[PDB]
Amino acid sequence: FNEPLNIVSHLNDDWFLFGDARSDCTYVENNGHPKLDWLDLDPKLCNSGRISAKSGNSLFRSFHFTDFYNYSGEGDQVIFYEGVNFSPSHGFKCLANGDNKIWMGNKARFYARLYEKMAQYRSLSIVTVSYAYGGNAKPTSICKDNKLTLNNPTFISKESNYADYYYVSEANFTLQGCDEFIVPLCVFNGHSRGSSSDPANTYYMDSQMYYNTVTGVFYGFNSTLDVGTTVQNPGLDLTCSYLALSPGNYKAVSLEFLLSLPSKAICLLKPKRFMPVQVVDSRWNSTRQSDNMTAVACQLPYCFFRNTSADYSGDTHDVHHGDLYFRQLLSGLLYNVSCIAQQGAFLYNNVSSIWPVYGYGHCPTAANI
Amino acid sequence: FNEPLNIVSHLNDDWFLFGDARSDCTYVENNGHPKLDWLDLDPKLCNSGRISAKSGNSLFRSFHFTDFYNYSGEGDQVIFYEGVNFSPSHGFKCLANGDNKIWMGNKARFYARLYEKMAQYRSLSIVTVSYAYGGNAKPTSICKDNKLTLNNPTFISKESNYADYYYVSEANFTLQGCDEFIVPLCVFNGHSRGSSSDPANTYYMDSQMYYNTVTGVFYGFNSTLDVGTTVQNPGLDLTCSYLALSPGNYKAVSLEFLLSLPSKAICLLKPKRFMPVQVVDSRWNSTRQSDNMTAVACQLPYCFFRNTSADYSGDTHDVHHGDLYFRQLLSGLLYNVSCIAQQGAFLYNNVSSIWPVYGYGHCPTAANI
Ligand SMILES: *[C@@H]1O[C@H](CO)[C@@H](O)[C@H](O)[C@H]1NC(C)=O
Ligand SMILES: *[C@@H]1O[C@H](CO)[C@@H](O)[C@H](O)[C@H]1NC(C)=O
Ligand SMILES: *[C@@H]1O[C@H](CO)[C@@H](O)[C@H](O)[C@H]1NC(C)=O
Ligand SMILES: *[C@@H]1O[C@H](CO)[C@@H](O)[C@H](O)[C@H]1NC(C)=O
Ligand SMILES: *[C@@H]1O[C@H](CO)[C@@H](O)[C@H](O)[C@H]1NC(C)=O
Ligand SMILES: *[C@@H]1O[C@H](CO)[C@@H](O)[C@H](O)[C@H]1NC(C)=O
Ligand SMILES: *[C@@H]1O[C@H](CO)[C@@H](O)[C@H](O)[C@H]1NC(C)=O
Ligand SMILES: *[C@@H]1O[C@H](CO)[C@@H](O)[C@H](O)[C@H]1NC(C)=O
Ligand SMILES: *[C@@H]1O[C@H](CO)[C@@H](O)[C@H](O)[C@H]1NC(C)=O
Ligand SMILES: *[C@@H]1O[C@H](CO)[C@@H](O)[C@H](O)[C@H]1NC(C)=O
Ligand SMILES: *[C@@H]1O[C@H](CO)[C@@H](O)[C@H](O)[C@H]1NC(C)=O
Ligand SMILES: *[C@@H]1O[C@H](CO)[C@@H](O)[C@H](O)[C@H]1NC(C)=O
Ligand code: NA
Ligand code: NA
Ligand SMILES: [Zn+2]
Ligand SMILES: [Zn+2]
C-alpha cells in the first residue's frame, strides 16, 4: 500500500514546471493531427499558469545561444522537463575541430548549478547583462556552427592597435535586480589561434577571470591543455564553469586572447526553505543520440531524478513527441501528493510498505500500525 | 506521543563525536573533585571509541594555530560539540589594531564548509601540507598575539634582495591522500605595512591566489578595504575563505605583500550518502563572551543545530564545565533513535503528534492511525 510512485508532483499549488515542446501548449500545426498531440503534459494543465515551456528550446540553449526563449517562473516545488534541445545529436562545437564532450561537460555543470540553486530559490528568469568597454573593439561571434550561434558569454574583438593576442584586456559589468546570479566563466583551454594567416608556431593560451570590485574575490581560468584548432591536433573548445554570484560591480579581466563576459544571467529571486527540485529525463527517441548530463547534474540533496523504463516512443506527432510512459510520469502534476521523496511520490501521508528516504511534505511510516 | 527530542543521537553505532574538554575523558586533575566532573559527555561513552576530544581545543583552533590537536574520526552520523575555544573572549587579532569581527567571520566560514562536507564524507582528519620554495626566505609568524600563534596559512618572508613589498612571489604545494581538502585562502584586506621604519605614505595591498596546475582554475583575493595598522586608522586583519579542493598540484601566487600558503588541511575521506551533521551550541558561562558563529554555519540541508534554553552553568568543576541541560542534550548518544530531523530526534518510527521535517532514518507519521 502507498508505494513510491514514479511521477513528478507537488505538495500544493505552489509549483512550477520548466519545459520544451512536450509541455508547450501554444505550439501550432496545420494538419490532420489530433489536438495537442505533441504534448507529454496533460492538456488540462495548459491553462494552469504554472508552466514555462517553448517548442524546440531548453534552459541551457536559451542561456548560451541566440535561439532564446525568456524562461520565467516561480514556485516552491520546481520541476524540470527539458534539456534534450541541446544534446550530442546537435553536435555543437565552437570551432570546426572542437569537441562535443566539452559541451556535454558544460551542460552537466550548468544544470547542476541551476538545480542546486532552484532548491533554495522560488523564482527563475533570464536577464540581459550589459558591459562598459573603454576600447573601440566590438563583440565577435567566435563560437558558432551552421545551426547555433553562441552569444553568452560575449567575446570582445582584438583592438586595431595590437598586432598579436598577447594583450591584457578588461571590462566592467553590473549585476542588479536579483538575489543571486548564475553566469558563465569560460575559457578556450588549449592552443588558440588569431588569424588564419598567422604562422604555425604562434598560438595563444586563453585566460579569463571575473573580479568583484567590492569584496576583492576573483575566480579565474587559465589554459593548460595541449589540444588545438587544426586537423593534426584537434580538441580545442570552450570549457565553462557556472558561478553563483551576489549582486555588485564586477570586472572581467582577460590576460591573453579574447575578453569574454556574461551577456545573460539566470536571475534568482525569493529565497525559500530548502526544497529539492524534480527533474524528468529529457531524451530523444533512440534513433537520435541523447545524453545523461541532467542525471549527472541531478544529485542529492538538491534534486530528485525521474525516468521511465522504456525508449521514448512518440504516438502520433512524431517519434520524439508524445510518449505514453512520460505522459503517465507527468500525470502526477494533475493532483497533490502528501510526500515527495527520493524513490518517488507517496500519495498518502499515513502508512506505506516502503520507508521514504529524503522525504518532503507529510511522509508515511512503514512501521506496523 | 513521540515528540521531537532536543538531543543529539544516532540511528546506529555508525557515529562519531568531535569535541573539547566537555567530551575529553583523558583529562587529569589532582583535587577533591568528583570523577570526570568536567564532562558534559556521559562517562559510559568514554570507552566507546567514537570520540575525538581535547581539553582546551577546537577544530578551528587546531586548523589555524600552533595549539594543535590531531582531531580524527569516522562516522555516518557526525556530531560536533566544540567551537568555544576560539571565541570573542579570546579576542584574537593578527595585529595590535586588528579586528575580532573578521576572525568571527572566519569562524563562521570555516565551520560552514566543514559541516557541509562532513554531511558528504565519513572521515575527518588534519594533515600537514608541505611546500616547495625556490627562494631563500623562510616562514614568518606574522599573525599572532600573546596567547595564540597562527601557523595556517604559513607566511613566507620577503627576500633580502627586494627593497619593498611590490614583488611577485609564488610556491608549489601538493595535496595528496584525501578525496577533498579544506584549505584556507587568506588576505590582509586593507593597507599593510612592511617594516616599522617605513614612511607613513608607503602601504601595500595584499593579494593572494591558489592555482590548480592541471585544470587551470584559480581562486583569489585582492585587497579593497581602507582599514590599516595604526591607531588613527585601525581594522586590518586576516580575512579567510575556506576552499574545498580536489587532490593535485597547486600553485600559490602572491602579487603583492607576503606569500601565504596552507600548512594544514582538513582531510576528507570515504564519501557517504547525504547525511546532515548534528551541531551542539558551544558557548561559555555568560560571564565570558560567546559567539553564534557555529549556528550561522549550521544551515539546512547539511546541518541540524541543537541548543539548550539556559545559561551554561557548571556544576562542580567550574562555571564553564558540566552543565545539567547539555548533559541531558548529549545523553541521547547513549542510545539509538529511529529518526533524526530538524526539530530534534524522534525515538520511535511509527507515530508522532508532530510531522518530522528533513527527517533521516525511519521516521514516524503524524497522521491518525
Ligand atoms: C571600470 O571600473 C573602474 C573602477 O574600478 C574604473 O576605473 C574604469 O573606468 C571602469 N571602466 C570603464 C570602461 O568604464
Ligand atoms: C595565466 O595566464 C597568464 C597569461 O598567459 C599568465 O601571465 C599567468 O602567469 C598565468 N597564471 C598562472 C598562475 O600561471
Ligand atoms: C551517465 O552515463 C555514463 C556512461 O555514459 C555512466 O558512466 C554514468 O554512471 C551515468 N550517470 C548517471 C548519473 O546516469
Ligand atoms: C521510436 O518511436 C517509435 C514510436 O513512434 C517506436 O516504434 C520505436 O520503437 C522508437 N525507437 C526506435 C525506432 O529506435
Ligand atoms: C492541492 O492543494 C491545494 C491547497 O493545499 C488546493 O487548493 C488544490 O486544489 C489542490 N490541488 C489540486 C490539483 O486539486
Ligand atoms: C509505536 O511503537 C511503540 C514502540 O514499539 C509502541 O509503544 C506503540 O504502541 C506504537 N504505537 C502505535 C500506534 O502502533
Ligand atoms: C613549481 O612548479 C612549476 C611547474 O609548473 C616548476 O616550473 C617550478 O620549478 C616549481 N617550483 C619549485 C620551487 O620547485
Ligand atoms: C590585484 O592586485 C594586484 C597587485 O596589487 C594587481 O596587480 C592586480 O591588478 C589586482 N587585480 C585586479 C583585478 O585589479
Ligand atoms: C546570531 O546573532 C546575531 C546577532 O548577534 C543575529 O542577528 C543572528 O540572527 C544570529 N544567527 C543565528 C543563526 O543564531
Ligand atoms: C554560571 O554558572 C553558575 C553555576 O556554577 C551559575 O550559578 C550562573 O548563573 C552562571 N551564569 C552567570 C554567573 O552569569
Ligand atoms: C544501535 O543499533 C545497533 C545495530 O543497529 C546495535 O548494535 C547497538 O547496540 C544499538 N546501540 C545501542 C547504544 O544499544
Ligand atoms: C491511510 O489513509 C488512507 C486515505 O485516507 C486510507 O484509505 C487508509 O485507510 C489509511 N490507512 C491507515 C492504516 O490508517
Ligand atoms: Na581571454
Ligand atoms: Na600576498
Ligand atoms: Zn502533431
Ligand atoms: Zn573537576
> What is the rounded distance in angstroms from the CA atom of residue A298 to the CA atom of residue A296?
6
Continuous segment of H or E residues that includes residue A62: helix A59-64
Find, among A81, A87, A6, A17, the residue nearest to A48 by Cα.
A17
Q: Cis omega before residue B184 (within 30°)?
A: no
Beta B180-188 vs B264-271: how paired, if at all?
A: antiparallel
In the PDB record, what is the listed experimental method? X-ray
Contact B274 A300 (CB under 8 A): yes
> What is the rounded distance in angstroms from the CA atom of residue B112 to the CA atom of residue B90?
21
Nearest-CA distance from A321 to chain B in Å? 36
| Partner residues linked to B211 by β-bridges | B218, B251
DSSP letter at A157 equals: P
By the 10 Å C-beta count (0-12 exposed, 13-18 middle, 19+ buried), B100 is classed as middle
- Cα B284 to Cα A79, B22, B310, distances in angstroms: 46, 12, 12
In DSSP notation, B26-41 reads: S----SSPPTTTT-SS
3-state secondary structure of A334: helix
Max Cα-Cα span within chain A:
81
Positive/negative CA dihedral, B61, B65, B66, B68: positive
Minimum-distance ligand 10 atom for the alpha carbon of B286: 14
Which grid coordinates are listed for B66? Answer: 600552533
Find, among B287, B288, B330, the residue nearest to B307 by Cα.
B330
The closest residue, in CA terms, to atom 13 on ligand 11 is B335
What resolution in angstroms, rounded to 1 decimal? 2.2
Continuous segment of H or E residues that includes residue A329: helix A324-330
CB contact at 8 A, A9 and A17: no
> What is the rounded distance in angstroms from the CA atom of residue B369 to the CA atom of residue A368?
10
By the 10 Å C-beta count (0-12 exposed, 13-18 middle, 19+ buried), A319 is classed as middle
Task: Give which of A187, A243, A363 to mutate to test B binding, by max B Cβ within 10 Å.
Answer: A363
A56 in the Ramachandran plot: left (φ > 0), alpha (ψ -120 to 50) or beta? left
> What is the rounded distance in angstroms from the CA atom of residue A129 to the CA atom of residue A33?
41
Q: After which residues is chain A broken (C to N over 2.5 A)?
A: none
CB contact at 8 A, B214 and B136: no
CB contact at 8 A, A63 and A264: yes
CB-based contacts of A160-166 (< 8 A; 24+ apart in sequence): A160/A136, A164/A194, A164/A202, A164/A204, A165/A192, A165/A194, A165/A204, A165/A256, A165/A257, A165/A258, A166/A204, A166/A256
Which residues in chain B are closer than 8 Å to A301, comparing Cβ atoms? Answer: 274, 301-302
CB contact at 8 A, B339 and B364: yes
Find, among B41, B67, B44, B65, the residue nearest to B52 by Cα.
B41
Ligand found nearest the CA of B279? 9
The residue whose grid cell reads 493532483 is A335
**Closest CB to A222 among B216, B219, B355:** B216
CB contact at 8 A, B124 and B270: no
Domain ranges across chain A? 14-335
Contact A358 B216 (CB under 8 A): no
- Cα of A13 vs centre of ligand 5, distance in Å, is 6
**Closest CB to A189 among B216, B356, B367:** B216
Contact A273 B220 (CB under 8 A): no
Continuous segment of H or E residues that includes residue B175: strand B169-175
3-state secondary structure of A107: helix
Find all residues with CB under 8 Å of B161, minimum gap 6, and list them.
none
**Closest CB to A350 among B221, B222, B367:** B367
3-state secondary structure of A110: helix
Nearest-CA distance from B25 to chain A in Å? 36
Positive/negative CA dihedral, B126, B128, B129, B135: positive
Ligand found nearest the CA of B284? 10
Contact B217 A213 (CB under 8 A): no
Positive/negative CA dihedral, B236, B237, B241, B247: positive
**A·B CB contacts under 8 A:** 96
Task: Give which of B117, B365, B369 to mutate to test A binding, by max A Cβ within 10 Å.
Answer: B365
> What is the rounded distance in angstroms from the CA atom of residue A113 to the CA atom of residue A122?
15
Continuous segment of H or E residues that includes residue B52: strand B51-53
Which grid coordinates are listed for B65? Answer: 594555530
